[PDB]
């Protein structure tokens, strides 16, 4: 039987990978980091409260100008916020109200969203007509589209619930690159700062590092015990952190190809919806199901602070590109800005 | 106050956007959200044409009441990752064929379509997001089941069934077996209706169940409930 021989070879390869990871690990991040000063207590106050959504807010994204926001809720409305003045720049009515992701273009020209309609809809913000119209609708996913991220005005990577990540060409609307290999539904997505690689967290308790220009998985990261719902690169692009339903955040390194540190507490038992990093990467912000965001010392696994003030589950997180503020969205139809 | 002309005009635009958002929310608050569920293509389509590829939107108005019925068919993924989106629906319309008690699902060996429907109903009814959400259970294809129960007994489906091979007793037994999967009888109600291929009063049953759910909601507002 060739199938049993190939299963034995796959088991041998997995054991070789595990042995190479074990032999390459000598001193953990705790053992080197325990000799530096902690960050103390990180206290943040709600500076703005963005009201106007009427259903559970499922996603958000910050602008690269660190002032403009976009948020998605089950109202069927994509509201673009001026976070400095608490002003609604745009309100985009959606064809499908079951939106679970939204992205904002780095140029600021476009907004994507997607959800249970299996379609990433690109919206042209800066039109000659003065309204926000659909640029195009990207179809081809057979499952719910769980995350989308703009590379530029013409390239976008969309995570989806068909156990498949996909890279699209917005000029043609065609499936440029298909990323396959995940067993469970892919729930999160995060682009590298140079947009050369990206990581995806799925429901197979695994994270995979893909290359955009070759379209095939480089490394696979395991260690979680439940469905990964959040993922985010470290700011230099050489590491990333995940968040799953087992109330643990794990930090993984691309070069070491290992898990470095678990950010978990005994008093936290609920799942993690959103994971975001600060500008320096020293603080890891994670949104949980117990209605608040916990700031973690990303180098020491210490609870640096708690961002409490949401009446329902914190579903989405976002730190501005200048690191000035963190914005938490939640199921109680509110967005809050913190400093 | 300490605002420019463009700042004041942007604030005015934001207030207009807030006004349109409030009107849209008030329009959507009077609509009835229904989640349509069932094990495969069993009776969803006949029910849909009786009132009227990702999620399917079905819009119909009955007695000056607008209904939003969502079909999550062909969403072949983990249900728990998107079933919390329908936490605030008015009721769940669960469609079950009565004639597939002896048919096989053909996806798994020795798998019954009826038992797959029981397992899906057990997962949906006792879900954490549907603790207080009522279920309008529809038992599709009663005439086909009535004419085929003479040829094939129900004991091949339920080994512990010892009643007569009649339509009424076995149909009541199937309804009781589906209602026994509700472990939250103190906080939710299951409405069961038997529907034929061409049955006109299906909408009225949905309207009555939705009206009972709306009465339950109305009471809470007065605190009375």
């Amino acid at each position: 039987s060739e199938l049993d021989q190939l299963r034995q070879e796959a088991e041998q390869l997995k054991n070789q990978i595990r042995d190479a990871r074990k032999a390459c690990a000598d001193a953990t991040l705790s053992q080197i980091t325990n000799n530096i000063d902690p960050v103390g207590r990180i206290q943040m106050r709600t500076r703005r409260t963005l009201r106007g959504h009427l259903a559970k807010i499922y996603a958000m994204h910050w602008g690269t100008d660190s002032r403009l926001l976009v948020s998605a809720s089950q109202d069927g409305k994509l509201i673009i916020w001026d976070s400095y003045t608490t002003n609604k720049v745009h309100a985009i009515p959606l064809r499908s109200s079951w939106v679970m992701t939204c992205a904002y273009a780095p140029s600021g020209n476009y907004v994507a969203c997607g959800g249970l309609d299996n379609i990433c809809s690109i919206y042209n913000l800066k039109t000659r007509e003065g309204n926000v119209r659909v640029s195009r609708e990207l179809a081809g996913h057979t499952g719910y589209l769980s995350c989308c991220r703009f590379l530029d005005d013409n390239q976008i990577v969309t995570s989806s619930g068909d156990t498949t990540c996909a890279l699209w060409d917005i000029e043609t609307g065609q499936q440029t690159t298909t990323f396959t290999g995940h067993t469970g539904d892919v729930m999160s997505l995060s682009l590298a700062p140079d947009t050369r690689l990206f990581v995806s967290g799925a429901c197979d308790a695994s994270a995979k590092l893909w290359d955009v220009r070759e379209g095939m998985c480089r490394q696979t990261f395991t260690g979680h015990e439940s469905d990964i719902n959040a993922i985010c690169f470290f700011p230099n692009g050489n590491a990333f952190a995940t968040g799953s339903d087992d109330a643990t955040c794990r930090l993984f390194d691309l070069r070491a190809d290992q898990e470095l540190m678990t950010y978990s507490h005994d008093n936290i038992i609920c799942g993690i919806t959103s994971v975001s990093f600060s500008k320096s990467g020293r603080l890891l912000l994670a949104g949980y199901d117990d209605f608040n965001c916990n700031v973690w010392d990303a180098l020491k696994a210490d609870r640096a602070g708690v961002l409490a003030g949401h009446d329902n589950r914190v579903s989405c997180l976002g730190v501005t590109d200048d690191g000035m503020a963190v914005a938490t969205g939640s199921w109680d139809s509110f967005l809050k800005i913190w400093n | 106050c300490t605002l420019s002309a463009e700042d004041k005009a942007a604030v005015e635009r934001s207030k207009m956007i807030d006004r349109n958002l409030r009107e849209d929310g008030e329009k959507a608050a009077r609509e009835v959200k229904l989640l349509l569920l069932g094990a495969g293509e069993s009776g969803k389509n006949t029910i849909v044409k009786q009132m009227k590829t990702g999620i399917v939107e079905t819009h119909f108005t009955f007695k000056d009441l607008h209904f939003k019925m969502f079909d999550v068919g062909a969403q072949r993924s983990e249900r728990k990752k998107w079933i919390h989106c329908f936490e605030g629906v008015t009721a769940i319309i669960f469609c079950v064929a009565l004639s597939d008690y002896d048919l096989v699902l053909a996806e798994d060996e020795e798998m019954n379509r009826m038992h797959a429907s029981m397992k899906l109903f057990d997962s949906i009814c006792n879900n954490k997001w549907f603790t207080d959400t009522s279920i309008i259970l529809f038992l599709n294809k009663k005439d086909l089941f009535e004419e085929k129960i003479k040829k094939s007994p129900l004991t091949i489906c339920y080994p512990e069934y010892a009643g007569s091979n009649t339509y009424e007793e076995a149909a009541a037994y199937i309804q009781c077996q589906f209602e026994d999967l509700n472990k939250r009888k103190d906080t939710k109600e299951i409405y069961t209706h038997f529907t034929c291929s061409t049955d006109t009063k299906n909408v009225q049953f949905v309207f009555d169940a939705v009206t009972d759910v709306i009465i339950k909601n109305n009471l809470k507002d007065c605190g009375l409930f």
Epitope: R67, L68, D82, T85, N87, V89, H90, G108, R128, E129, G130, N131 | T2, S4, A5, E6, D7, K8, A9, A10, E12, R13, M16
Partner: single-chain antibody, 234 residues
């Protein structure tokens, strides 16, 4: 395409009443605030009236306030300027101007072709241009300077300075909308700069396509005041 067509102009006896219409097509008329800007035969842009989106805010120039009436009907995309008691100084070519206001928006971006109406026979921000007409060689850089009585820099960091170019026999177009921001469809050879009350507009590698009268307008506070107009010749 975005188009604004004006109508209703003509010869009017003094003290008469006429109504101007501005039919809008090719854009979402309801979401745009709308301005009336007239230009007398002496070649000077003058702001007349403004109506916001939703008709919630209406402003008038001090010379037409209580005597002109601006209104819009968003169902049919028409802007109205009901004028009563017309005197000889109202003889001007009235432009219907399109302007939207949000963060990063470009107001005064589209101007209509204008309708010509003929009448027979203190605290404002003064906008000053030192040069009224200068000759320029094509292919060479030119600078148009503008000054303001009040500082146009606001507390929010925006300097509300607008640059308009009006070619001969054409409606004015927007070039720079906040003292540095290049407009849409205008070449990168137009650049604006300045600080406080001193302003400049640089046109490197000038062509015959740039020949016209250049106006500086402030949008810090109403009424909106234009410059005298710097004309480029040769």
């Amino acid at each position: 395409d975005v188009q604004l067509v004006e109508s209703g102009g003509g010869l009017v006896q003094p003290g008469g009443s006429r109504k101007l219409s501005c039919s809008a097509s090719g854009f979402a008329f309801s979401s745009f605030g709308m301005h009336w800007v007239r230009q007398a035969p002496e070649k000077g842009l003058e702001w007349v009236a403004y109506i916001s989106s939703g008709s919630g805010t209406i402003y008038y120039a001090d010379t037409v306030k209580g005597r002109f009436t601006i209104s819009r009907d968003d169902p049919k995309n028409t802007l109205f300027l009901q004028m009563t008691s017309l005197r000889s100084e109202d003889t001007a070519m009235y432009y219907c101007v399109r302007s939207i206001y949000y963060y990063g928006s470009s107001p005064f971006d589209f101007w209509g072709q204008g309708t010509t109406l003929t009448v027979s026979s203190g605290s404002d921000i003064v906008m000053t241009q030192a040069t009224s007409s200068v000759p320029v060689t094509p292919g060479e850089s030119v600078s148009i300077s503008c000054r303001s009585s009040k500082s146009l820099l606001h507390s929010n960091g925006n300097t509300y300075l607008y640059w308009f170019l009006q070619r001969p026999g054409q409606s004015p177009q927007l070039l720079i909308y906040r003292m540095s921001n290049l407009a849409s469809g205008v070449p990168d050879r137009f650049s604006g700069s300045g600080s406080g009350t001193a302003f400049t507009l640089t046109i490197s590698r000038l062509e015959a396509e740039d020949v016209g009268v250049y106006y500086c307008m402030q949008h810090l506070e109403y009424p909106l005041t234009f410059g005298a107009g710097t004309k480029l010749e040769l």
